[PDB]
C-alpha cells in the first residue's frame, strides 16, 4: 500500500464558511476526510496530514514559506512514496514554480492542489482535487512538481492562475497538460540524489512596457536594491526604439543587473536569441525569457540569485531549460 | 449609392513587401493591389479611400503622440465618410484601440482597427480577409464604437489584449464576448499626452524598498497587478508605501494578474486592506484599458480624487460592474 505525505499549508479547502468569511478550524480537514469513504477505498494510498499552524493565506506566502515546504518534503522524502501540498489558489503557481527549481533530481511526485470552497460543499472541487492528487502522487510516474486543478495535472513551472476565481482557475498556456483525470481530449532529469536548494527573498522588479514609457520611470525600476528586472514586452519580445529606454537598460545590465524579456501575451514565446537577433533589447544586455510564465521567471531568478553565481552565470542559466519551464525556439 | 469607408494605413505588414532584410515599405503598394482584387469591388463592399501614412509606424514604436495623430485623422475625416478602418501593427494594436475608445467621445460611426502579420498578397493571408471583413462590417453591420477585428472576430477595442505572441489568432477579449462572430452630443476628440505611469506585478515576498521605487517622481499613477480577485500580502511594509503614495496624490489601481475575471474591491464595500491604503479597483479592465484610461484622465484638468472616481466608472464599455 503506497503512503503519501500531505502538507495542509493553507487554503479554504479545510476551512468553515461563516458570515465573517472562511475561518480556520483546527483538525477540520482531517476529521472530515476520516468520514469520507472515497478516501479509504482499497486503491487509495494511506496518507498522513501535517496541518500548518497557523494556516497561511497564499497571498501572504514569502520565499521563507517556499523553503519551509521544500524542507518538509526533504525531511519526509525517504518516509513516503509521494507528496501532496494543500495551498491557497492566489499564489499556488508561484509555490509550484519555486519548488520545481528548489527540488533538483526529484524522483517522487509532488502535487500541489487546493480549493477556494470548503470541501464538504457541492460547489467545491476539494474532494476530487485531493482524491486525484493522492492517487496520482502514489500511482502516476511523473516525478515533477505538478499542480492539480479542474481534473487536469499541469507541470507546476508552466502554471498561471488564468481566471480570478472559479473551478477552472489554472492554465498551462505554453505546455500541454501532463494528464486529464476526467474528460479526455485526443520530462526533467532525476539522475543523482535529491538536492534541496535554499532560496531567500530577492529584490526583483516585474514591469510592463507601454507606448511612450519614459526613461525616468524605467530608471526608477532599476534603482538599488534591484538585482533583476523582468520586462513584459509586446508580441515576440519587442519594445520601443527609444534611446532613453535602451540606455537605462544597458546601464543596468553593465552594472550586473539581470534584465529578462517576457511577452505580455497569454501564450507564445519571446524570439530574441542573444547571438542571433536584431532586437535592440539584446544589444542593451536584455536576455530572452522564451515562453516562461511570470511565475517561472520570478521564481527562477530567486533560485539563481540565492546561489553564488555571477550576473553572466545567471544570464546563461536563465536562458537554459532547467526543470521543463521553457521551450527552445 | 454605396457606403464610403476611410482606410488609414498607419503601419504593419499588410501593405509591405517581404525581403531578406524582413518587410520593407512600398509606397502605394496596398492601394495598387486592392484596385486589382475583384472581391473588394462587389455590390455589398463599400467604396473606400486608402491614406498611407508616411512614414509607416512600427506599432512597437507607437507613442501617445501617434494615438493623437490617428484620433485627429479620424476627426478630420469624420464628416466625409460613413466609417473608418485603421490598419496598424499587431504589437500595440490593443493599446491604440483602447486609447481611441476614450479619446473619441460620442462616436456615432464605426471605427475598426485591424491588420495582418503577412502581406495582403500572400497565399491564405489574413491581410485580404481582415481588411475585406473590416470594410464589409463597417458598411453593412456598423457598431458605433472603436472595435478591433482579427481572425473572423469583432471585439470591443478597450476589451482586447494580444492573446498569442504571434499567429493568425493574435487577439482576445477575455472579459467580454465578441461584438460579432463573423464566420448623445457631437463627437468630442480629447487630447492625450504621455503620462508617467508605473505598471507592476506583485509576487511573494515583494519588498517595501522595491515598491517604494515604483512610486518615486515622476510617477503619477501605478497599476498594481495583484492575485486572484485583487489580493496582496497583508504586511504593513507594502501597504504603508502604497498609502504614502496615495496620500501624495498618486492614483494606485488594482488589476488582477489573471487573464480573465475581475478584481472584487468596491470602494465603499470592501474589507481589502488595499482600499484602506487608498488603492482603487480596476474591476475586470485589461492592462491596455487601464493604462490608456489613466493617460486619458491624467491628460485633462482633473484632481487625483476626480481621476479615482472616473477610473472606477464604466466610461466607454471597458469594465463591468461587479
From TrEMBL, chain A:
<feature type="binding site">
    <location>
        <begin position="89"/>
        <end position="90"/>
    </location>
    <ligand>
        <name>substrate</name>
    </ligand>
</feature>
<dbReference type="Pfam" id="PF00710">
    <property type="entry name" value="Asparaginase"/>
</dbReference>
<comment type="similarity">
    <text>Belongs to the asparaginase 1 family.</text>
</comment>
<dbReference type="InterPro" id="IPR027475">
    <property type="entry name" value="Asparaginase/glutaminase_AS2"/>
</dbReference>
<dbReference type="InterPro" id="IPR036152">
    <property type="entry name" value="Asp/glu_Ase-like_sf"/>
</dbReference>
<dbReference type="InterPro" id="IPR020827">
    <property type="entry name" value="Asparaginase/glutaminase_AS1"/>
</dbReference>
<keyword id="KW-0378">Hydrolase</keyword>
<dbReference type="InterPro" id="IPR027473">
    <property type="entry name" value="L-asparaginase_C"/>
</dbReference>
<feature type="binding site">
    <location>
        <position position="58"/>
    </location>
    <ligand>
        <name>substrate</name>
    </ligand>
</feature>
<dbReference type="InterPro" id="IPR040919">
    <property type="entry name" value="Asparaginase_C"/>
</dbReference>
<dbReference type="Pfam" id="PF17763">
    <property type="entry name" value="Asparaginase_C"/>
</dbReference>
<dbReference type="InterPro" id="IPR041725">
    <property type="entry name" value="L-asparaginase_I"/>
</dbReference>
<dbReference type="InterPro" id="IPR006033">
    <property type="entry name" value="AsnA_fam"/>
</dbReference>
<keyword id="KW-0963">Cytoplasm</keyword>
<dbReference type="GO" id="GO:0046872">
    <property type="term" value="F:metal ion binding"/>
</dbReference>
<dbReference type="GO" id="GO:0009066">
    <property type="term" value="P:aspartate family amino acid metabolic process"/>
</dbReference>
<dbReference type="InterPro" id="IPR006034">
    <property type="entry name" value="Asparaginase/glutaminase-like"/>
</dbReference>
<keyword id="KW-0106">Calcium</keyword>
<keyword id="KW-0479">Metal-binding</keyword>
<dbReference type="InterPro" id="IPR037152">
    <property type="entry name" value="L-asparaginase_N_sf"/>
</dbReference>
<comment type="subunit">
    <text>Homotetramer.</text>
</comment>
<feature type="domain" description="L-asparaginase N-terminal">
    <location>
        <begin position="4"/>
        <end position="186"/>
    </location>
</feature>
<feature type="binding site">
    <location>
        <position position="313"/>
    </location>
    <ligand>
        <name>Ca(2+)</name>
    </ligand>
</feature>
<protein>
    <recommendedName>
        <fullName>L-asparaginase 1</fullName>
        <ecNumber>3.5.1.1</ecNumber>
    </recommendedName>
</protein>
<dbReference type="InterPro" id="IPR027474">
    <property type="entry name" value="L-asparaginase_N"/>
</dbReference>
<feature type="domain" description="Asparaginase/glutaminase C-terminal">
    <location>
        <begin position="205"/>
        <end position="318"/>
    </location>
</feature>
<dbReference type="GO" id="GO:0004067">
    <property type="term" value="F:asparaginase activity"/>
</dbReference>
<dbReference type="GO" id="GO:0005829">
    <property type="term" value="C:cytosol"/>
</dbReference>
<feature type="active site" description="O-isoaspartyl threonine intermediate">
    <location>
        <position position="12"/>
    </location>
</feature>
